[PDB]
Design a protein around this nucleic acid. Structure first.
Ligand SMILES: [Mg+2]
Ligand SMILES: [Mg+2]
Ligand SMILES: [Mg+2]
Length: 759
DNA sequence: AAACGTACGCAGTTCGCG
DNA sequence: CGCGAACTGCGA
C-alpha cells in the first residue's frame, strides 16, 4: 500500500521515493527514471529547434531543455498538437517556463506547475491507500508552560503524552504519582525519551490535534533551544514544516502525520472545535478541559498536577480514538482523489477536485488548462452569477411540516444536462440541452469530462448511505453518516469549482447554468405541490423546502407528501430525485437561512441561529435554546415569555455568573489591517499594547462592563476580569445579547413580543 | 509555492449624513 | 437623532 511519495536530489538528479507498507513491512521504493516535463503549443513546428536552445539559471545551475517530443492530445475534447519538453530536475521548470512562454512562436505552455511527487502518482497510475494493509498508529499531545506576553515556545514543554492500542502514557519531568506517568529529570530527557518511544514503536501514522500549527512547531522550537536532533522520520529526518497558502502543515517523512483538526473541521458542524467538544460530539461522553492558566499554576506551585497529567493523558487517548474512527473515511478520500492521505486530509476542496481532474485528464489524454494569470484571475473575481433560490419565510409557528429536498441537486444537473466546459457551445453537436435564463447550450452527443466522473462519486455516496442504515452500531452509523455527507459536499463543490477563480477548468457559464436549472427545478416542485396537492410551502432554500397542508392532521400530511413525491419524481427527469428527509411536529422560520424545527422524537434541529454562531454569550445562547424548547416542544409561548423575563431579571439583579456573559470573536488579520473599531478589536489592540501576542486566529474572550462610551470602550478580556472591582453591563446583556435573538423568534411566530424584558 | 468551491444571507458594531 | 452604509464574522 502506497503511503506517501516525495523526491530527493541525488547528485543533481531527482529521485522519487515511494513510501509503502507491503506485508507489514515499511519499504522505500526509489525511481531515478522519472523526468519532469511540461507542454508548449507552437505556431509552427519549425520553432521547436529554436525553443530547445532556451536556457535559464537556477541556484548556480544552468537549466537546459533535455528532450522534446511532439504529441497529439485533446484540449477540452478538441484535438491539439503540443510539444512535450523534458528536463533533468523538476525545479528546472519554474526557472525556465516563463522564458519559453515568452518566445514569439510559443502560443502558450501547459502543465508547468504540477508538483513532482503528485505528477508521479498521476502519470504512473498509482493510487495511495489501496489494499487491506493494516497501519500502525500512535497519537501524541503536548502540554506547555505559557505566560502572557511571551514569544512562541519560550517556556518549556511540561508533558508529552502518547496513546495507541497499548494504552496512554505521559512523559514529564516532575514527579506526578500516576501509573501511566513516566518521570524524567529535565525537559531534554522528556523529549529524547518521546523520540525513542516513537522510534521504538515505529508507527505508520502520527495522530495529533492541531499539531500542524502547535504541537510540532512547539517541539521544533524547543529542540533548537535544547540542541536536540528530533529525528522523527523513518529516514532520520526531522519534521518538515510546509506552507499551505495561509497556514502551516507538518510532514514526517516515511510516516503519515494525521492532523485531525482539518479533518474534523470539514466533517462535523460544531460551534467550536475544541478537542473536548469534538470528542463529546462523536462518542457521547464528556471530556474535561484544563486551561493553560491552571496548568501553569499547578506546575509552578507543584500542587494539583495529577489533574493536569490526566488531562494530558486524555488528550492523547481521545486523539487516538478519534484517529482510529476517521482514518477509514480519509483513506477512502485518498483513494478517490488519488493523492496521499497527508495532502487529501488538509487540502482545500478546490485542490481535491483539481487533483482528481488532473489524474482523469492524464488518463483520457486531455491537456490540462492552466491556472489563470493575474489579469484573468482578477477578472474572474469581478464577475459573478445568480445562485440558489431563497424564498422569504412564511411567518408563524407551523405544525405538521415535511422537509423535501433533492438528493444531489447540482451534481444531478451536471450529469443529466452534460454541463461541462468541453460540451459548452460545442459546435457540430446533434443535440444540446439549453439552460434556462442563462441560455447556455450543452452538447449531449458525448458525456462531458466532468459529468462522466461525477456519477461514480454519487454512486460512492449511496454505497456508504446504504451501509449507513444497515449498520445498527450507533458509532459506525454516525461515522458513515459523516463520510457519506463528505462525499455529498465533494460532489457539490464540483459545481462551485466551476466558479472558483483559481480553477483550471473554470466555467462561469457552466456554474450559472447549474444554478439556473436548480432554480427552475425547485420552483417547479414548489408550484406543483401547491396547485396540484394543496400544500403551502412555508420556506424554501436552493435544494429543498418546508411545506404543510394548513389545518390537516399529521397522518394526512405524510400521506399526501408521499403521494406528491410519486407525482414529482416521475415528472422530474434524469438523476433528479426529490427526497423525503423528515417530518416535524412544529417549526418556524425567522428569516432566510434561519429556521428551527422539532421532529416527532422531540429532537430539535436548527439552522443559522445564534446558538451555533460565535459572538453571542452563553447566557444568550442558553436562553434562546430554552425558548426553542418552550415553542417547538411545548407550544407554550407564555413559558417562552416567562423564560426571557426571568433571565433579564437575573441579569438586572447581578445573579448571573459572569462566565456566561463572555463573548468569543476571532481576530482575522494583523491588528493594523482593521479598517473599523470593534469590541473584540479594541481588546486585542489593548492586550497587544500591554504585551500580549495577538495574531490572525486569536479568539478574543471579552465581557462588556457597565461604563461609558461605545461597546468596545467598555469591553475587557475575561482573564483580566475581577468580579470584585468590575460591574458587568447588565443593560447591554439584556438589550443587546439576550433580547434580540428571542425577539426575532417571537416576532417570526406572529407575536409582538411586547415587554419581554424585566421592568 | 501553492493559494478560499459557489451565491445567498443575517446581524452586531460603529458613525457620519440628512 | 433616526438611518443606512461600511465594516465585520460567519452560517444550502
Ligand atoms: Mg509531500
Ligand atoms: Mg467570481
Ligand atoms: Mg424521475
Amino acid at each position: 500500500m502506497i503511503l506517501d511519495t516525495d523526491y530527493i536530489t541525488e547528485d543533481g538528479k531527482p529521485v522519487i521515493r515511494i513510501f509503502k507498507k507491503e506485508n507489514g513491512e515499511f519499504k522505500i521504493e526509489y525511481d531515478r527514471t522519472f523526468e519532469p516535463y511540461f507542454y508548449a503549443l507552437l505556431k509552427d513546428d519549425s520553432a521547436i529547434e529554436e525553443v530547445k536552445k532556451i536556457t535559464a539559471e537556477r541556484h548556480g545551475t544552468v537549466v537546459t531543455v533535455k528532450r522534446v517530443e511532439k504529441v497529439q492530445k485533446k484540449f477540452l475534447g478538441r484535438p491539439v498538437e503540443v510539444w512535450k519538453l523534458y528536463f533533468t530536475h523538476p525545479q528546472d521548470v519554474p526557472a525556465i517556463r516563463d522564458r519559453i512562454r515568452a518566445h514569439p512562436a510559443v502560443v502558450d505552455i501547459y502543465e508547468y506547475d504540477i508538483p513532482f511527487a503528485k505528477r508521479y502518482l498521476i502519470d504512473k497510475g498509482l493510487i495511495p491507500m489501496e489494499g487491506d494493509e493494516e497501519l500502525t498508529m500512535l497519537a501524541f499531545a503536548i502540554a506547555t508552560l505559557y505566560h502572557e506576553g511571551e514569544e512562541f515556545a519560550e517556556g518549556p514543554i511540561l508533558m508529552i503524552s502518547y496513546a495507541d492500542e497499548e494504552g496512554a502514557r505521559v512523559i514529564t519531568w516532575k514527579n506526578v504519582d500516576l501509573p501511566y506517568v513516566d518521570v524524567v529529570s529535565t525537559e531534554r530527557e522528556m523529549i529524547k525519551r518521546f523520540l525513542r518511544v516513537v522510534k521504538e514503536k515505529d508507527p505508520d501514522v502520527l495522530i495529533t490535534y492541531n499539531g500542524d500549527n502547535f504541537d510540532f512547531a512547539y517541539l521544533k522550537k524547543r529542540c533548537e533551544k535544547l540542541g536536540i536532533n528530533f529525528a522523527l522520520g523513518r529516514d532520520g529526518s526531522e519534521p518538515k514544516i510546509q506552507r499551505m497558502g495561509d497556514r502551516f502543515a507538518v510532514e514526517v517523512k516515511g510516516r503519515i502525520h494525521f492532523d485531525l483538526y482539518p479533518v474534523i473541521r470539514r466533517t462535523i458542524n460544531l460551534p467550536t472545535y475544541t478537542l473536548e467538544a469534538v470528542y463529546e460530539a462523536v462518542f457521547g461522553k464528556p471530556k474535561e478541559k484544563v486551561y493553560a492558566e491552571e496548568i501553569a499554576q499547578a506546575w509552578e506551585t507543584g500542587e494539583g498536577l495529577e489533574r493536569v497529567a490526566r488531562y494530558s493523558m486524555e488528550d492523547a487517548k481521545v486523539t487516538y480514538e478519534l484517529g482510529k474512527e476517521f482514518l477509514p473515511m480519509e483513506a477512502q478520500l485518498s483513494r478517490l482523489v488519488g493523492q496521499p492521505l497527508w495532502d487529501v486530509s488538509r487540502s482545500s476542496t478546490g485542490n481535491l477536485v483539481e487533483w482528481y481532474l488532473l489524474r482523469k485528464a492524464y488518463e483520457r489524454n486531455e491537456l490540462a488548462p492552466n491556472k489563470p494569470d493575474e489579469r484573468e484571475y482578477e477578472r474572474r473575481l469581478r464577475e459573478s452569477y445568480a445562485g440558489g433560490y431563497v424564498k422569504e419565510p412564511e411567518k408563524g409557528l407551523w405544525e405538521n411540516i415535511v422537509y423535501l429536498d433533492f438528493r444531489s441537486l447540482y451534481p444531478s444537473i451536471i450529469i443529466t444536462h452534460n454541463v461541462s466546459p468541453d460540451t459548452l457551445n460545442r459546435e457540430g453537436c446533434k443535440e444540446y440541452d439549453v439552460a434556462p435564463q442563462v441560455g447556455h447550450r450543452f452538447c449531449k452527443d458525448f458525456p462531458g469530462f466532468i459529468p462522466s466522473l461525477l456519477g461514480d462519486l454519487l454512486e460512492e455516496r449511496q454505497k456508504i448511505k446504504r451501509k449507513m442504515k444497515a449498520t445498527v452500531d450507533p458509532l459506525e452509523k454516525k461515522l458513515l453518516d459523516y463520510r457519506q455527507r463528505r462525499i455529498k459536499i465533494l460532489a457539490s463543490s464540483y459545481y462551485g469549482y466551476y466558479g472558483y477563480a483559481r480553477a483550471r477548468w473554470y466555467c462561469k457559464e457552466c456554474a450559472e447554468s447549474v444554478t439556473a436549472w436548480g432554480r427552475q427545478y425547485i420552483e417547479t416542485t414548489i408550484r406543483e405541490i401547491e396547485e396540484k396537492f394543496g400544500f403551502k410551502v412555508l420556506y424554501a432554500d436552493t435544494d429543498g423546502f418546508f411545506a404543510t397542508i394548513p389545518g390537516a392532521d399529521a397522518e394526512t400530511v405524510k400521506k399526501k407528501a408521499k403521494e406528491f413525491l410519486d407525482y414529482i419524481n416521475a415528472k422530474l427527469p434524469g438523476l433528479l430525485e426529490l427526497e423525503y428527509e423528515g417530518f416535524y411536529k412544529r417549526g418556524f422560520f425567522v428569516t432566510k437561512k434561519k429556521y428551527a424545527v422539532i421532529d416527532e422524537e422531540d429532537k430539535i434541529t436548527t439552522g443559522g441561529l445564534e446558538i451555533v454562531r460565535r459572538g453571542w454569550s452563553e447566557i444568550a445562547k442558553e436562553t434562546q435554546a430554552r425558548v426553542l424548547e418552550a415553542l417547538l416542544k411545548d407550544g407554550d409561548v407564555e413559558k417562552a415569555v416567562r423564560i426571557v423575563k426571568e433571565v433579564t431579571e437575573k441579569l438586572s439583579k447581578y445573579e448571573v455568573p459572569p462566565e456566561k456573559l463572555v463573548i468569543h470573536e476571532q481576530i482575522t488579520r494583523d491588528l493594523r489591517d482593521y479598517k473599523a473599531t470593534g469590541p473584540h478589536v479594541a481588546v486585542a489592540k489593548r492586550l497587544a499594547a500591554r504585551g500580549v501576542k495577538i495574531r490572525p486566529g486569536t479568539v478574543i474572550s471579552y465581557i462588556v462592563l457597565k461604563g461609558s462610551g461605545r461597546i468596545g470602550d467598555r469591553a475587557i478580556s475575561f482573564d483580566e476580569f475581577d468580579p470584585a472591582k468590575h460591574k458587568y453591563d447588565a443593560e447591554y446583556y439584556i438589550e443587546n445579547q439576550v433580547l434580540p435573538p428571542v425577539e426575532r423568534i417571537l416576532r417570526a411566530c406572529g407575536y409582538r413580543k411586547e415587554d419581554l424584558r424585566y421592568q
